[PDB]
Amino acid sequence: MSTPGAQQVLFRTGIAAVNSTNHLRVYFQDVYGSIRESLYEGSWANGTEKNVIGNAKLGSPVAATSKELKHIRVYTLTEGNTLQEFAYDSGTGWYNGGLGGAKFQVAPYSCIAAVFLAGTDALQLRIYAQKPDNTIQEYMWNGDGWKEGTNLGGALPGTGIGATSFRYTDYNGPSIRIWFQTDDLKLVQRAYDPHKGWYPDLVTIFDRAPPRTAIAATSFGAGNSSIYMRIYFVNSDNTIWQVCWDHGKGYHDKGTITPVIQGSEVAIISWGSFANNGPDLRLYFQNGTYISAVSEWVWNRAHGSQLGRSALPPA
Ligand code: NA
């Protein structure tokens, strides 16, 4: 009922994913603590011992962001509970990124979210993690080196963190949205727009979620003061739930998506738009396929919601 390859995947591994349209990369932790990359270039590949991009503390969070597949950054925790980065650039390959040298100390139970800021060719990064005082701290890279950005206040110790960046087509700079769990177990959004900065208000997206539930988010289809967003978390029913932001409706359409193992982590990628025979969504999680394999859920225009690849490489 398992496979040799499935047995190599850590149960409740952190999961992250990046893409350029339907060209996909998925990152996960093996049972030895190595971070591996599985890939989709027309078919699923890799995820083996030969596809290791670095090592992290066992049980580390795993976050990733990209500029198409030209630049990829993967964030995890060291054994010393400092932030670290595995970097890929086209023409260079993989290397140990400069974030680790800053030795930013976070809570041992911190999660991580990461985004490249949208709508610029410049490489601008925002990383979100939880300090020992349980506050959410932004870390920035704007070409001058890593610096602390805005502190976004208290959250539940060990909260999941989701993040997305998009640029409205009528705006002169990028927007950011992040989601986390507060000390009262609610799920909330914080928001950055270039005229308002960080909005003061925490917007509740779900009234009560399991403590330290996984949180993952995406955005797509930016237009003139318009955006679409999807947030995923693991609910008390041992399923992933989806919360939708749709332009002109706001937050609505909250409901279950797919069952998962107790304590599954979650990753989401998206591409395209309602306007051009999209969008496409791909969700990654553990649902007990081959016990410990990572599985995929798909949304597309052709067939809507359905389970995708049942067991990613190496399973
Ligand atoms: Na973990």
Curated annotation (Swiss-Prot):
Zn(2+) binds at C244, D246, H252. Alpha-L-fucose 4 binds at R177, Q189. Alpha-L-fucose 3 binds at R126, E138, T150, W198. Multispecific lectin that is able to recognize L-fucose in all possible linkages. These could be found not only in decomposed plant matter in soil, which is the natural environment for A.fumigatus, but also in various epitopes on human tissues. Mediates binding of A.fumigatus conidia to airway mucin in a fucose dependent manner. Homodimer. Alpha-L-fucose 5 binds at R230, Q242. Keywords: Lectin, Metal-binding, Repeat, Zinc. Alpha-L-fucose 6 binds at W44, R282, E296. This is Fucose-specific lectin. Sequence repeats lie at residues 2-53, 54-103, 104-155, 156-207, 208-260, 261-315. The keyword Zinc applies.
